[PDB]
């Protein structure tokens, strides 16, 4: 287990992905250039998961940039880490998919795989242990959604037994950019239940409601949203970029996870929270950190984790910090709120300590938890697409691309079905 | 690279056409001989080898007066001969001379054109029609053209820029039955259509530009400013586009409730000097009101199914969101209960562009409001009303019924407006 | 036998992914073929 594959698909996909990239490399210590000017040898002990090293002294981002729409491309080259990336590594068409979830899975999404497969199929056989992959995009789009749940089952049918990791941003009605997005994710959430192992649920109502109720952002921009994701990406992939005992690799993080096979999204959570601008700020300590993890507050899916139950929780502080008080923090935290934590999984909360902090903080902490909570984002979804679907509202944009209204049907009933089996683990109990 | 063929049909239509590439080439900076001293304005201009900039539209008239003028004028050097199309006899007013008689004379000549021009782009996105629902070409032609497109294009957007008729403009008694057969038609073949009612026009002229008697010059002047708006996002790059599709997208939740309302703010007299400049809010404000509308209808009596707020100049997001924020807590605006999502917001950096020695005041920011209300069902309404009043005598039913048109044709696409109108209602009832 | 049993069991599962996964590239071929015969057919239509 070393290479990880990374694929951006979409506006969304590509924008989150770029901003991976430029967060991952300074944390990394590499400039825009792929050169190394870091001083720390952690730095590169694990520089091999996500990089490769190319002739010399210099790191190539081990990532597919891919699109139907030519633009989106042009303005990641355009942009501070934009040379970092391989030429060949950009796969785009001419003709978008107009926000349409068909058109990137069926028509258009369908005459492009063949090339970015070709393009991830160089990347894999280059590597030493493939570990899998791992895929950036939204779920209300046409190209990230449609065509990159297209990409996962291509991959999934080539690489059956590599993990397949996604960071999947949900729509909201608060920074919408089309009707049909309850259509696109609902279709998508279909996909993502029968073929990732693990998936990031990075809510758009969330990190809205953060930057306008947290931030005070009067009117949030995708670079203020953008600014918190990438902020929840480099936390999450912490313990698969540098050393250290837990969770470190893709299928340890599923194994430690994912208890039932469809339970494998994963609601994302950061400490301290700030703005682009926020270059104060002076605070944080370790037990203000660890009570941010039941705070519905600092959640990037927009659900209250004490209306659940975690199932198992991944918890990763970074700076220099007391690995004692940590530790004491995280046991009183169990025990105070023994009521949301499920009784029939021992020792589910699993901590780790880094002592490289992100940019910007001297100390932060990271939650990734598989909670019962997590239904309230798919109710949402169900809500919003039964609104829309009981009177076939905008159907013929998708049934005009050669769909079955019997598909929109059965993504619905899957995603409700998924609702139904995190209530069912919620209500469970060590009666044994 | 994402190409627009413009097709301009009829006196309506073609003069409408000749304001639209006027505004145009001032937007774009482009002299009236092609030459020019972005790079979107590429899906509407098509370059020679000589860098002159050329329309990449068909201009189509049954009779030659109108294109004559077009070949003669100022605008002379701007399109190529071949794309300036005329016939020799006119529809006479009469759809079924437009459609059958006169018109299957030219229709093989104006495709091989059009297929010229689809030659030429690498993208194609599809076609914009000009036309009046009225005269004989602009409703006859139009959906004999619209329907050879369908079958040539396969599935191509088509979009329309349809001129609703006025009695104060009126050169027809027979208009409303040439807007009902073209309506039918062109129905099954369109995927957006544009309705601009000549009264809407002639009163905004008379009330915001102090226009006594306004003449085609004055509403043309005014029309253009409207499509350029739509048009825009196609031609520039700015920080909020939307493509053919996704106008399509957002403003159409069934195949045939596929006809936004238009309203434009400001319209500001060339005179004065005191009455500017309005402010995001002011203008935002502005498309709410009936008498900025392009079609006369009461959106208060009917539901919005979708909103798309299009901004030109001197906008920035945050005084949009704040100005739409004011307008929902005004309750009169209502929704259908199957849609959440109402505004789509678009902001493009060019502040409007005004013709010289024009009626239009020069504004630093400008807004166009798309918006699918049951409301416009009104306009149809009308429209099948002056019809039945007619044909129940079968008044001037002759002159079709010579031409080899049948009198079903006419049951037929009235029962079709019938449904159309049952559709509106069908629409705005919750489930 | 209790090692290449699990070499057997280990092929039955993944034989069947890629069945599941053969049936949904099937899906993708008809919904695509079917999104040009109607197209195909609404111009057969159209012209007689
Ligand atoms: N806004 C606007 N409406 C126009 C213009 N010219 C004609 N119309 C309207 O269109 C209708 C008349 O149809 P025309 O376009 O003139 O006729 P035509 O398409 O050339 O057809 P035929 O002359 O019968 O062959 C009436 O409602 C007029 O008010 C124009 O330049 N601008
Ligand atoms: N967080 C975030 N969401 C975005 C961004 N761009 C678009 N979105 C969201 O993604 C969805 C639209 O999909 P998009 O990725 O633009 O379309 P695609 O290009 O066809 O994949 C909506 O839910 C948008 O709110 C971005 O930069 N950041
Ligand atoms: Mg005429």
Known sequence: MREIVHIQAGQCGNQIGAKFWEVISDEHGIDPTGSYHGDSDLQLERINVYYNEATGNKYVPRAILVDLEPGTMDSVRSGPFGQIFRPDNFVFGQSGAGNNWAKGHYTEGAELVDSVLDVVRKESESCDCLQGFQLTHSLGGGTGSGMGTLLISKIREEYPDRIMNTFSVMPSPKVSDTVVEPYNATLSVHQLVENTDETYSIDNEALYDICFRTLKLTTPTYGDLNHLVSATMSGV?????????????????????VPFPRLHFFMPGFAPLTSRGSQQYRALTVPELTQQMFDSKNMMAACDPRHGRYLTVAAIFRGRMSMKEVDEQMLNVQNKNSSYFVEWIPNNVKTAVCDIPPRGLKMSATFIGNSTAIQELFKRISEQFTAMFRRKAFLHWYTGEGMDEMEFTEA?????????????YQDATADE | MRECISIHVGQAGVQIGNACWELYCLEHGIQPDGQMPDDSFNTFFSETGAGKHVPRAVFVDLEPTVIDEVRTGTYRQLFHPEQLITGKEDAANNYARGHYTIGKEIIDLVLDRIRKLADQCTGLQGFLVFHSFGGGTGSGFTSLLMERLSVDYGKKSKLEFSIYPAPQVSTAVVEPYNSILTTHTTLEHSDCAFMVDNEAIYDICRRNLDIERPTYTNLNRLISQIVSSITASLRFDGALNVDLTEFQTNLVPYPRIHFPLATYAPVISAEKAYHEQLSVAEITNACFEPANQMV??????????????????????????????TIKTKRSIQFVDWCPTGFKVGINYQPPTVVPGGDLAKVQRAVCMLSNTTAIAEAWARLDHKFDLMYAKRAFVHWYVGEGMEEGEFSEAREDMAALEKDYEEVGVDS | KKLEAAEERRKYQEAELLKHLAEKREHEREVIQRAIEENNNWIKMAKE
């Open chain 1, 412 to 424: 619905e009933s899957n995603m409700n079905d998924l609702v139904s089996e995190y209530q069912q």
């Open chain 1, 237 to 257: 992939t912490t313990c698969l970029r540098f050393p250290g005992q837990l969770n470190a690799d893709l299928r340890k993080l599923a194994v430690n996870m």
């Open chain 2, 296 to 325: 006369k209808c009461d959106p208060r009596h009917g539901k919005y199914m979708a909103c798309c707020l299009l901004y030109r100049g001197d906008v920035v997001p945050k005084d949009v969101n704040a100005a739409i924020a």
